[PDB]
Amino acid sequence: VDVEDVPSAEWGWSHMPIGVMHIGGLLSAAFLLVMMRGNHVGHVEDWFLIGFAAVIVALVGRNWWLRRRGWIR
Amino acid sequence: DLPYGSALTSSGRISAVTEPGELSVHYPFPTMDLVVLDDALKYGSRAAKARFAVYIGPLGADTAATAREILANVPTPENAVLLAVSPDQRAIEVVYGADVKGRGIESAAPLGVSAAAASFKEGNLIDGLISAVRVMSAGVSPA
Amino acid sequence: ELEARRPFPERMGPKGNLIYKLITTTDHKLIGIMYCVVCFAFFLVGGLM
Amino acid sequence: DFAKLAAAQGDAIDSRYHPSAAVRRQLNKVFPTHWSFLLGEIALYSFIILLLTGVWLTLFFDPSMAHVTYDGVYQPLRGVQMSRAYETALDISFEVRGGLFVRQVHHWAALMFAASIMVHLARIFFTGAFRRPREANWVIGSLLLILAMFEGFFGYSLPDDLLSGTGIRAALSGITMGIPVIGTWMHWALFGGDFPGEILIPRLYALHILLIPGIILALIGAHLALVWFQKHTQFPGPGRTETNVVGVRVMPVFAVKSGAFFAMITGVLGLMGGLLTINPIWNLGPYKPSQVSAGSQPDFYMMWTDGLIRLWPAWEFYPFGHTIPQGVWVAVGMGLVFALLIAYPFIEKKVTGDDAHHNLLQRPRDVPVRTAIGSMAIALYLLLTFACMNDIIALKFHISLNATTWIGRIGMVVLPAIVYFVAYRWAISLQRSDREVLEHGVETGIIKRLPHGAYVELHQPLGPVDEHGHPIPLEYAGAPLPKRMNKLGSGGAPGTGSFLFPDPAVEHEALTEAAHASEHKSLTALKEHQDRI
Amino acid sequence: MHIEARLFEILTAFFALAAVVYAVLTAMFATGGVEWAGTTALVLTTGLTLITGTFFRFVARRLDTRPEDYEDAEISDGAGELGFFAPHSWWPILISLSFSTAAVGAALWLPWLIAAGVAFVITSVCGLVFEYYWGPEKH
Amino acid sequence: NRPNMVSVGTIVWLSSELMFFAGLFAMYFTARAQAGGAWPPEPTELNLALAVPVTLVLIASSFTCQMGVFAAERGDVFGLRRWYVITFLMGLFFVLGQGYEYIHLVEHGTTIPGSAYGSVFYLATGFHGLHVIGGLVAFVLLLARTKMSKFTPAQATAAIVVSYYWHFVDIVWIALFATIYFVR
Numbered sequence A: 001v002d003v004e005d006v007p008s009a010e011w012g013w014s015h016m017p018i019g020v021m022h023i024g025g026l027l028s029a030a031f032l033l034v035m036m037r038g039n040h041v042g043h044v045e046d047w048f049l050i051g052f053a054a055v056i057v058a059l060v061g062r063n064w065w066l067r068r069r070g071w072i073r
Numbered sequence B: 001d002l003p004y005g006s007a008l009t010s011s012g013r014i015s016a017v018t019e020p021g022e023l024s025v026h027y028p029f030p031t032m033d034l035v036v037l038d039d040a041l042k043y044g045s046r047a048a049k050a051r052f053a054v055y056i057g058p059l060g061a062d063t064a065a066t067a068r069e070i071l072a073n074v075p076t077p078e079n080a081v082l083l084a085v086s087p088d089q090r091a092i093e094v095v096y097g098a099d100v101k102g103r104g105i106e107s108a109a110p111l112g113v114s115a116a117a118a119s120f121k122e123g124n125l126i127d128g129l130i131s132a133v134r135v136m137s138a139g140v141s142p143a
Numbered sequence C: 001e002l003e004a005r006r007p008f009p010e011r012m013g014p015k016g017n018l019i020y021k022l023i024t025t026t027d028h029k030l031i032g033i034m035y036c037v038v039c040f041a042f043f044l045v046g047g048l049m
Numbered sequence D: 001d002f003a004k005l006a007a008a009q010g011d012a013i014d015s016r017y018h019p020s021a022a023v024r025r026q027l028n029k030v031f032p033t034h035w036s037f038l039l040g041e042i043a044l045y046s047f048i049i050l051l052l053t054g055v056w057l058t059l060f061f062d063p064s065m066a067h068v069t070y071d072g073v074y075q076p077l078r079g080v081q082m083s084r085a086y087e088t089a090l091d092i093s094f095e096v097r098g099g100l101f102v103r104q105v106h107h108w109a110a111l112m113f114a115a116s117i118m119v120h121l122a123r124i125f126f127t128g129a130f131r132r133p134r135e136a137n138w139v140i141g142s143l144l145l146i147l148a149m150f151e152g153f154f155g156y157s158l159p160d161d162l163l164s165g166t167g168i169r170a171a172l173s174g175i176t177m178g179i180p181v182i183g184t185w186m187h188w189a190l191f192g193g194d195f196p197g198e199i200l201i202p203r204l205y206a207l208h209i210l211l212i213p214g215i216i217l218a219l220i221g222a223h224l225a226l227v228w229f230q231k232h233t234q235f236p237g238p239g240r241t242e243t244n245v246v247g248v249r250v251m252p253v254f255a256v257k258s259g260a261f262f263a264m265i266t267g268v269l270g271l272m273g274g275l276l277t278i279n280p281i282w283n284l285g286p287y288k289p290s291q292v293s294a295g296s297q298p299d300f301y302m303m304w305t306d307g308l309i310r311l312w313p314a315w316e317f318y319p320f321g322h323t324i325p326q327g328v329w330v331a332v333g334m335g336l337v338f339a340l341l342i343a344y345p346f347i348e349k350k351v352t353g354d355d356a357h358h359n360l361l362q363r364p365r366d367v368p369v370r371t372a373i374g375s376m377a378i379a380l381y382l383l384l385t386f387a388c389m390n391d392i393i394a395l396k397f398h399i400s401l402n403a404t405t406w407i408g409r410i411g412m413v414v415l416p417a418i419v420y421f422v423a424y425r426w427a428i429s430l431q432r433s434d435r436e437v438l439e440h441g442v443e444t445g446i447i448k449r450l451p452h453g454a455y456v457e458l459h460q461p462l463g464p465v466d467e468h469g470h471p472i473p474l475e476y477a478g479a480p481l482p483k484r485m486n487k488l489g490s491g492g493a494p495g496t497g498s499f500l501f502p503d504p505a506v507e508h509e510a511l512t513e514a515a516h517a518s519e520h521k522s523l524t525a526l527k528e529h530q531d532r533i
Numbered sequence E: 001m002h003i004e005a006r007l008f009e010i011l012t013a014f015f016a017l018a019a020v021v022y023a024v025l026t027a028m029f030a031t032g033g034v035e036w037a038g039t040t041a042l043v044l045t046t047g048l049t050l051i052t053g054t055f056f057r058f059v060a061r062r063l064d065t066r067p068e069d070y071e072d073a074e075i076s077d078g079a080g081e082l083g084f085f086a087p088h089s090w091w092p093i094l095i096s097l098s099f100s101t102a103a104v105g106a107a108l109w110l111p112w113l114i115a116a117g118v119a120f121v122i123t124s125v126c127g128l129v130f131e132y133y134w135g136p137e138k139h
Numbered sequence F: 001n002r003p004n005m006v007s008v009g010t011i012v013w014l015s016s017e018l019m020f021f022a023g024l025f026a027m028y029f030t031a032r033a034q035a036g037g038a039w040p041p042e043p044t045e046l047n048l049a050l051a052v053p054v055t056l057v058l059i060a061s062s063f064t065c066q067m068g069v070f071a072a073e074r075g076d077v078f079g080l081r082r083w084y085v086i087t088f089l090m091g092l093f094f095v096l097g098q099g100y101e102y103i104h105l106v107e108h109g110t111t112i113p114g115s116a117y118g119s120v121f122y123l124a125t126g127f128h129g130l131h132v133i134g135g136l137v138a139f140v141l142l143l144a145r146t147k148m149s150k151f152t153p154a155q156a157t158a159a160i161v162v163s164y165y166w167h168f169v170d171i172v173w174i175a176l177f178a179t180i181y182f183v184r
């Protein structure tokens, strides 16, 4: 990172690669979706899992698209 | 001599107005193209530690003396790299201060002129400015 | 009379620009903005009801 | 008399052992005075109190699983069948004067020991104190934390009451026997057969009073010796370098402070032991496999593991006529956690590429990625710990128990991600807050209206100024910046006297002048040392 | 600041008249006689405006005209220091979290949570009140 | 030459806090109008041998508080501390005297669940007592702040507004004492 983005960039670990966070988000979403497999008989929680996974996938996709298009760095 | 609705205040600042529904800025280019040029300027200047500037307007007859006159208006002009363009006279000028000499700008400034000229022949003014800034800043080192 | 400007004003502040302000601010302008944002989120919640 | 005796004994000691130079080296050793460097010795003092009270307890405890009929004073359990271990735990708390107090001080000291280890670990991790040359000593500490967890678990399993026996049946017996291929062999080696058997409590007792505490004592000795001879880290500040230690010598200041802190920690643990009930085992009854109670939590330092059991889904595999049950996941998970904790310094030097000697600490704001990672880890730890108490929380706070399970399950993925992002941005935000004071000085809070109507806040520069009067921007030096004018001395002092009556004005004047002169001399000494080096 | 006092005195006149009228009109030909809740509320609303108006009226007759009370004051009349205005603080959010802890404790009737919340409130309010008065650390 | 801003804010807030007691007075008078002739009803026996001395101690705490204010306006931090310590001790005595009255009332069968009179009596006097406890906390915090820095005009203003609150609490008690122990 540049010091304009992280002022103490030369004092410590200041950069995490974006691929790590994108892949971690996708894997976390997939893990939310795999907990639909279980013994539970209700589906309220299935909808909560689907919604949280959808929000995560949308955030990852927005970030990836905006980095590709150059709007954020 | 002040525009309508503009006032000189007790601090020397100008307090201006716009008619409701009208714009303050009105540059004849799309907003997202202006954002792209702004990012090109900012991140080119950060990567080279030299302030990059762009001029659009009439450059006169010599057009290099005028460009050197305009460079005095860039902040910290000794460390600045100005690209001035006259769409009418169809002229491209690059002028830089002394702090930037010896940092890679003699190689990159003509490359910036070529990059601008290639896009101008297609009728793409802002695209030419963006491309030229990108090539010239990629060729200057923070030295 | 050439004043240097930016081609477009900055879209957002840098990273770290906002979050500590939000929890330490005594600026009535920022507090008013925070009120407007949170009140509108509550408006959406009540409208969903 | 008292001085001649000291000289005579000193000469007798020096003629026989000639220890003068080594002793003097110990007296002149310098320790930094930062408040957070006192976190490790809370753990040390808790361990010492545990040793003393535990030795007292072994004089009365019979760890036998032999079944007997209770013949003691506690009427609600008269005639009830119980082990000798539960019997003698009751005898300690009712038939030995001071036994209940000693037992409660022991258990509170165990809780403070685990909590101190956790907080001290957080300091080590967030300040970067694990970096070379100190990787091994982080590893030793990690082992100390694991051993403390299992030592406390074995300790509260000893009385063989219903609650702790329920904990033994599920965790020590159930998870173990679930282990693939070797699970049941490990169970029958540990228990001597099936649960509960007859050897478990005597064996755990031997592990708890001698074997594990001996390993812990050896590891603590190695740990403190490494700290002592590697010379404690310090924060950046005036006069502090990578090659020096700024602080106070052992004799007398650090010794007095350490002894007084030990006395105060002992006082707190003694007040807790005789003001707050912990583990009143007579209310629980003896352990019987047919009985159970609602609310089967372990001690807090084990809760996360229990929380993991509660949250992980019922995922099992049945390959070729065999069974891999759910608990295996938890076992693997625990190993993974421990392996990641022990290995962290080497992971970070592999990722960052930084393999330099480090004696100056990092402020947590200045290492935003590691601070975000540690905050993420603490968020996961807290979520698992509260998942373990999900049934209590459901009862007290009116949440569906099913809902708490699903909140823990989803939050186990979502809360660490949110916490990581927030902590990262918050750390960079504190960096920017420091930068602001560096360019503009300290905001004093005093607003002024200029003659033309401008409003300006007065700033106090931290360095030299311009001819225009604005401060010259200062460079960040890894050290904290003042942000309140009162912390720079702007408030002055009230006026010398008792709380109700003033002293004579001449006394006040002399005292104030002496205080200002001393403060200036101290600042000048640090400044000139810094200028020289 | 005579207008500031006058505003509250005018409100006071209306509130006192309304309180007297309501008490007298409900005592006569209203079922049960005096309606005590509304009468009490009107009397003490009158008291509220009376306290503030009397304070403003006493303050006004002390100090002579301020630049904001002067019809043709100049901007430069107001030059100088205004006072202290806190530049930043994270103590307000701590106070509100503490008070919300005590409130959740009172809602669910958990006396230990109420005790913890009250202790949190006292600590947070001390943190706010002392923030600009703690001296330097001493060593 | 200008209003004390902290003073005006404190006065404005105190006037608002009068409406909070308006609600409780409304509750009391509603329950009293529905009494049916017996007010206080049996077995409640109010005793003035103890309410009156506690009331007088609380009134005298106002004079001691005003003395502290005069010292603060004079710039005398030690006189302010002495008078505010005396005021704190007297208000603490008021709180303990009220608690003793409560204890003797509960043993004879006047409680919050027991009767409508007990409900209004205890909410009214107990919320006033909570206000007294808040004022004692305020005295403690103010006195600790005078030891933190030199005695400035802002510090004296803080003392003055704490006294405004204490006088409000005393006057509210006079009103509550008149309506409960004499306008029965």
Ligand SMILES: CCCCCCCCCCCCCCCC(=O)OC[C@H]1O[C@H](O[C@@H]2[C@H](O)[C@@H](O)[C@H](O)[C@@H](O[C@H]3O[C@H](CO)[C@@H](O)[C@H](O)[C@@H]3O)[C@@H]2OP(=O)(O)OC[C@@H](COC(=O)CCCCCCCC[C@H](C)CCCCCCCC)OC(=O)CCCCCCCCCCCCCCC)[C@@H](O)[C@@H](O)[C@@H]1O
Binding pocket: A041, A042, A043, A044, A045, A047, A048, A050, A051, A052, A054, A055, A058
């Ligand atoms: C808000 C934002 C989004 C957009 C705006 C609004 C969206 C929300 C709209 C949802 C509407 C739901 C219905 C409302 C009414 C209600 O109250 O419910 C009805 C009834 O329902 C249950 O009866 C089912 C039948 O009606 C009965 O006939 C049947 O018998 C019964 O059978 C069960 O029980 C039997 C024994 O009795 C067993 O025999 C049998 O096998 C079975 O188990 C049934 O139950 P069951 O299927 O369990 O549950 C299912 C119920 C239960 O309600 C529910 O919707 C559950 C609640 C869902 C909550 C959604 C969470 C959203 C995620 C978060 C936003 C993520 C985080 C992001 C935040 C900020 C992000 C910014 C950073 O319906 C549903 O899910 C409806 C389906 C659709 C839900 C919507 C999902 C949207 C998300 C997907 C997209 C992602 C978002 C995009 C991102 C970009 C019983 O309970 C009944 O009492 C109850 O009466």
Ligand code: HEM
Binding pocket: D036, D037, D038, D039, D040, D041, D043, D044, D117, D120, D121, D124, D129, D130, D134, D137, D138, D139, D140, D141, D142, D144, D145, D148, D220, D223, D227, D231, D232, D233, D234
């Ligand atoms: C029984 C448990 C432990 C005890 C009694 C203990 C005790 C201490 C003490 C007294 C110190 C020196 C003073 C200080 O900085 O606080 C210290 C330093 C240290 N501890 Fe621990 N510790 C324990 C566990 C741990 C853990 C869990 C870690 C980390 C995983 C750790 C790593 C370190 C390191 C790296 C140092 C030296 C730090 C420095 O110089 O600044 N220890 N320990």
Ligand code: HEM
Binding pocket: D047, D050, D051, D053, D054, D055, D056, D057, D058, D061, D089, D092, D103, D104, D106, D107, D110, D113, D148, D151, D152, D153, D154, D155, D156, D157, D158, D159, D208, D209, D210, D213, D216, D278, D279
């Ligand atoms: C790391 C150190 C230790 C920890 C964390 C620890 C923890 C515990 C705990 C939690 C208990 C249950 C207490 C209870 O009854 O309520 C216990 C019991 C016991 N511990 Fe320790 N202990 C430690 C060290 C020692 C040592 C060194 C001894 C022996 C000298 C000892 C002797 C005992 C005995 C005899 C009991 C059983 C009697 C009883 O429960 O009351 N402990 N321990």
Ligand SMILES: CCCCCCCCCCCCCC(=O)O[C@H](COC(=O)CCCCCCCCCCC)COP(=O)(O)O
Binding pocket: D006, D007, D008, D009, D010, D011, D013, D014, D019, D020, D023
């Ligand atoms: C620990 C048991 C005995 C403790 C007494 C020893 C310390 C006092 C003796 C020396 C100080 C006074 C001056 C003096 O007598 O000078 C000399 C004694 O000291 C020495 O030279 C050797 C002392 C080294 C031993 C210390 C080891 C541990 C002691 C630390 C205890 C806190 C004798 O003076 P002289 O010969 O008359 O010039």
